[PDB]
Amino acid sequence: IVGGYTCGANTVPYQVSLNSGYHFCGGSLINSQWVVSAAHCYKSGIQVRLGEDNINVVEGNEQFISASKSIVHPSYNSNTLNNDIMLIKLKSAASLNSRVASISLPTSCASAGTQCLISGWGNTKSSGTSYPDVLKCLKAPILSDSSCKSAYPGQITSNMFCAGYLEGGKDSCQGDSGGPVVCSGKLQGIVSWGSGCAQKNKPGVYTKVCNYVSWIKQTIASN
Numbered sequence: 344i345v346g347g348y349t350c351g352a353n354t355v356p357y358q359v360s361l362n363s364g365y366h367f368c369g370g371s372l373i374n375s376q377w378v379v380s381a382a383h384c385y386k387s388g389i390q391v392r393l394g395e396d397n398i399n400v401v402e403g404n405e406q407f408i409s410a411s412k413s414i415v416h417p418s419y420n421s422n423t424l425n426n427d428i429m430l431i432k433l434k435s436a437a438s439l440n441s442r443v444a445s446i447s448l449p450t451s452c453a454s455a456g457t458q459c460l461i462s463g464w465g466n467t468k469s470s471g472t473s474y475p476d477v478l479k480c481l482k483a484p485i486l487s488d489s490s491c492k493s494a495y496p497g498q499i500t501s502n503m504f505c506a507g508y509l510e511g512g513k514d515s516c517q518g519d520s521g522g523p524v525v526c527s528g529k530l531q532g533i534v535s536w537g538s539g540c541a542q543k544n545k546p547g548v549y550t551k552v553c554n555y556v557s558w559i560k561q562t563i564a565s566n
């Protein structure tokens with residue numbers, strides 16, 4: 344997260360870190376057994392780390408649970424990033440309390456101008472590289488479809504939206520991938536892609552979660 348703030352420990356209780364020997368992506372806990380992330384975060388051997396603040400220090404609220412199965416969206420295209428969503432099942436159910444909690448799925452799509460909270464352990468610099476240990480947060484608005492398409496000609500599908508600031512300076516970044524965009528207490532986006540980070544006229548692009556609620560629910564019901 345570039346141009347954000349330190350969230351505070353366990354203030355984003357649905358935020359998970361996906362670990363394969365090291366943090367590599369965010370995700371969002373959506374029930375005791377299941378995490379939503381980006382398909383471009385797929386790999387084998389994932390351990391889901393819930394209750395994290397400092398990802399390099401055991402602070403007392405962690406739950407580390409290996410994934411039993413990952414399901415990339417049936418129509419994910421890794422070239423275009425269309426349908427950049429993946430479900431991860433935990434081998435055991437997480438213990439839920441105020442520091443580790445699921446986030447609700449949307450019942451309706453969000454509109455441009457809605458304010459959201461984007462979070463993660465990704466790079467905090469727009470030029471060069473610095474990875475935080477503690478969770479970072481950014482409040483940002485959803486942008487109009489027309490401004491999103493104008494920013495990224497030929498690239499924005501109906502399964503994507505832009506959020507952030509066209510002036511630059513405030514965005515998600517590498518290592519935030521897969522993590523949440525939460526608006527009015529609902530998971531509306533997944534950190535997906537962008538050109539660099541926090542660049543002028545190049546906002547963040549996010550998977551439009553409201554399009555996937557049917558698929559998420561039916562997948563959970565049978566897996």
Ligand SMILES: [Ca+2]
Pocket residue numbers: 395396397398399400401402405
């Ligand atoms: Ca920790």
